[PDB]
Amino acid sequence: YDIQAWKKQCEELLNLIFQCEDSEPFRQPVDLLEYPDYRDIIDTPMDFATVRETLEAGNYESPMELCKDVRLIFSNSKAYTPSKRSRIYSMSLRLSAFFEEHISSVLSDYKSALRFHKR
Ligand SMILES: CCOc1ccc(CC(=O)O)cc1
Ligand SMILES: CCOc1ccc(CC(=O)O)cc1
């Protein structure tokens, strides 16, 4: 029932994401020189270094907030892709499936710890 355990669990999950090849297009903010119309379609850019830095700065209060920002990386990729068969969008779908598979226990354990605290 460790209320703070989600933080290190999220740091480890971000390490796994950074290690895999599929994360390369999403590790740093999108390069507007590579994609000049990016901010005409995407309102809020997000990338894994910004998520990691926000976590390390102590600027997430819960794993749900981290999960919302990681989900925004994937929804931005889906909104920007000209095709659902594109290379970069295909990488985002694989990364999203891996992320969701692992974040589920982080969220469940955190919410369980809070309930135990408020029992
Ligand atoms: C991380 C930058 O985000 C993306 C860049 C390009 C595409 C679309 C494409 O294949 O050109 C999809 C997402
Ligand atoms: C032990 C870590 O194993 C994996 C890591 C990342 C992915 C996600 C992806 O490659 O897109 C899948 C499996």
Closest CA to 92 of 21, 44, 35, 32: 21
d(CA 77, CA 67): 16
User: What is the separation of C-alpha 5 from the centre of its chain, rounded to a whole number of angstroms?
Assistant: 18
Q: Which residues contact 72 (CB under 8 A, 6 or more apart)?
A: 44, 46
Q: Which residues contact 63 (CB under 8 A, 6 or more apart)?
A: 6, 9, 10, 103, 106, 107, 110
For 46, which DSSP code? -
Enumerate residues lining ligand 2, CB below 6 A. Answer: 16, 20, 22, 94-95, 98
d(CA 46, CA 60): 15
Among all bound ligands, the one having the nearest atom to the CA of 73 is 1
Query: 93: domain range?
Result: 1-119
Which CATH number belongs to the domain containing residue 101 in this structure?
Answer: 1.20.920.10
Among all bound ligands, the one having the nearest atom to the CA of 42 is 1
What is the count of structural domains for the chain? 1
The method of structure determination was: X-ray
